[PDB]
Design a protein around this ligand. Structure first.
Ligand SMILES: *[C@@H]1O[C@H](CO)[C@@H](O[C@@H]2O[C@H](CO)[C@@H](O[C@@H]3O[C@H](CO[C@H]4O[C@H](CO)[C@@H](O)[C@H](O)[C@@H]4O)[C@@H](O)[C@H](O[C@H]4O[C@H](CO)[C@@H](O)[C@H](O)[C@@H]4O[C@H]4O[C@H](CO)[C@@H](O)[C@H](O)[C@@H]4O)[C@@H]3O)[C@H](O)[C@H]2NC(C)=O)[C@H](O)[C@H]1NC(C)=O
Ligand SMILES: *[C@@H]1O[C@H](CO)[C@@H](O[C@@H]2O[C@H](CO)[C@@H](O[C@@H]3O[C@H](CO[C@H]4O[C@H](CO)[C@@H](O)[C@H](O)[C@@H]4O)[C@@H](O)[C@H](O[C@H]4O[C@H](CO)[C@@H](O)[C@H](O)[C@@H]4O)[C@@H]3O)[C@H](O)[C@H]2NC(C)=O)[C@H](O)[C@H]1NC(C)=O
Ligand SMILES: *[C@@H]1O[C@H](CO)[C@@H](O)[C@H](O)[C@H]1NC(C)=O
Length: 338
């Protein structure tokens, strides 16, 4: 009858108990120091469910766990209305260049300068690098691009050679705002200021930093008219073509559980969201399920809704094939010595 949520960390736990109070014991709590550990608890059946990102889903899918509800995020386009009925699409990981540099295509990237949001980031790293392994067949992506700015790698690396830090020699290649070329924005600036030949960002990154949308000096005089997406065809389409010229769709996070206790979770959550969701009965009142004393506890903070999925998809399908191609190959290069 009860659903046991698994909290990764002492603060998720703190929230999970409030949830349990308000829910009048309909949702109780397990907890673990790691996510992989919470996954396990779901397998062992010591905990029922928890929300996971593209990558953890895979992990858990492979261990035979199942997506249940996606986590839809507030957006520019999303109707925002009756979102519970289906998932929204989620970021389009795109490769971006300037129109100038004609030679550049998804095929001719070897030994170019690269700009990454940060290491281990989905659109900035996992997706693009994952699909380059698919090309090269090899795992030596550390040495694919001549030099790069990938915040979070070793400052000594060539993967950090392009990163600028605070421009006073400090905080080179760190995954913070302190690193000049960090983030979607920073990777895009990395491109704009001709430090790098390709930037791996998302659709909007381009738009929201062109044609007046950004007041930053490097951004003032930037026209979408001057940048191209790279498609997997090796075709260079305009910036407006993200929809059919992306690398992959960043997966929406997803609530996950065993099939044997899948539809129960589903049924129990939709109610808890009605009580505690963005505009549920008791949200401004007793407990908001998508607000966090810290940030992103149990659920990302900017969660519109948990969404009924489209039938009964396997993780392979829920994640999209492009993404798995990637995470797979980075999971093969990962765990290389067996
Ligand atoms: C790739 O990335 C880009 C960048 O994010 C993205 O473009 C954005 O698309 C959205 C949706 O098409 C645009 O949103 C609309 O913007 C207007 C206001 O526009 C101005 O102000 C913004 C900044 O605040 C500027 O960026 C923009 O250039 C304009 O100057 C809003 O009024 C719209 O509101 C609607 O939001 C929802 C949209 O589905 C709905 O809730 C509803 O339609 C809202 O509006 C209206 O509906 C009522 C019924 O018709 C009507 O009666 C009401 O009066 C009301 O008008 C909406 O937010 C956004 O501006 C774009 N941003 C940029 C920078 O271009 C692409 O969509 C994305 N595409 C791909 C390829 O993935
Ligand atoms: C934790 O999970 C439990 C179990 O799912 C939730 O319990 C439900 O709580 C609601 C509200 O307290 C219950 O709903 C109401 O029950 C009334 C009487 O109960 C009988 O009839 C309903 C069906 O009508 C049966 O489901 C139930 O077993 C009983 O036989 C009903 O009269 C109400 O329905 C009528 O009036 C409303 C309002 O006008 C109409 O909208 C309806 O169409 C209908 O005419 C209503 O169903 C519900 O039955 C409970 N389930 C149980 C115990 O079986 C907890 O809410 C949840 N807790 C939290 C905080 O998350
Ligand atoms: C690379 O990616 C595409 C799309 O995932 C796939 O169809 C193709 O066969 C892959 N190539 C190799 C050699 O795996």
């Amino acid at each position: 009858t009860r659903v046991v949520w698994c909290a990764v960390g002492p603060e998720e736990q703190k929230k999970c108990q409030q949830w349990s109070q308000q829910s009048g014991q309909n949702v109780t709590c397990a907890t673990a120091s790691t996510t992989d550990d919470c996954i396990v608890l779901v397998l062992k059946g010591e905990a029922d469910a928890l929300n996971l990102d593209g990558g953890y889903i895979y992990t858990a899918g492979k261990c035979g766990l199942v997506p249940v509800l996606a986590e839809n995020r507030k957006s520019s386009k999303h109707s925002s209305l009756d979102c519970v009925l289906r998932p929204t699409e989620g970021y389009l990981a795109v490769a971006v260049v300037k129109k100038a540099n004609e030679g550049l295509t998804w095929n001719s990237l070897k030994d170019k300068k690269s700009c990454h949001t940060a290491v281990d980031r989905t659109a900035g790293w996992n997706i693009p690098m994952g699909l380059i392994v698919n090309q090269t067949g090899s795992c030596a992506f550390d040495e694919f691009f001549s030099q790069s700015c990938a915040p979070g790698a070793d400052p000594k690396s060539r993967l950090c050679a392009l990163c600028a830090g605070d421009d006073q020699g400090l905080d080179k290649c760190v995954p913070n705002s302190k690193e000049k070329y960090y983030g979607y924005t920073g990777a895009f600036r990395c491109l704009a200021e001709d430090v790098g030949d390709v930037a791996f960002v998302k659709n909007d990154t381009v738009w929201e930093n062109t044609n007046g949308e950004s007041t930053a000096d490097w951004a003032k005089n930037l026209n979408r008219e001057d940048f191209r997406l790279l498609c997997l065809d090796g075709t260079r389409k305009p910036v407006t073509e993200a929809q059919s010229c992306h690398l992959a769709v960043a997966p929406n996070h997803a609530v996950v559980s065993r099939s044997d206790r899948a539809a129960h979770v589903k049924q129990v959550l939709l109610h808890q969201q009605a009580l505690f969701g963005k505009n549920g009965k008791n949200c401004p009142d007793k407990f908001c399920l998508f607000k966090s004393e810290t940030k992103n506890l149990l659920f990302n903070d900017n969660t519109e809704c948990l969404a009924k999925l489209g039938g009964r998809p396997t993780y392979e399908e829920y994640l999209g094939t492009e993404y798995v191609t990637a995470i797979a190959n980075l999971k093969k290069c990962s765990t290389s010595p067996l």
